[PDB]
Amino acid sequence: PQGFSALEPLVDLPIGINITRFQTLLAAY
Amino acid sequence: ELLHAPATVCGPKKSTNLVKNKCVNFNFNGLTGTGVLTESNKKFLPFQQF
Lengths: 29, 50
Fold this sequence. Notes:
Chain A: It comes from Severe acute respiratory syndrome coronavirus 2. The first copy, chain A, is mostly loops. Helices cover 0% and strands 0% of the residues of chain A. Chain A binds chain B through residues 8-9, 14, 16, and chain B through 5-6, 8, 45, 47.
């Protein structure tokens, strides 16, 4: 992961929900 | 009602023919100003607006 690269936007959802924690669905990240 | 979340339902918006090489009062998606419009050779990226 050595180098530089800019990230472009994908979406914008007007959900408006409070989020405090997250979990993934599944070998490394 | 209209007091629970950000507005996601909106009324239709009309459009007017655009003119070039003339001093007008333009309004592009809420961007306001005065000037003349002419063709360009800029290379806007696909996700950029102005």
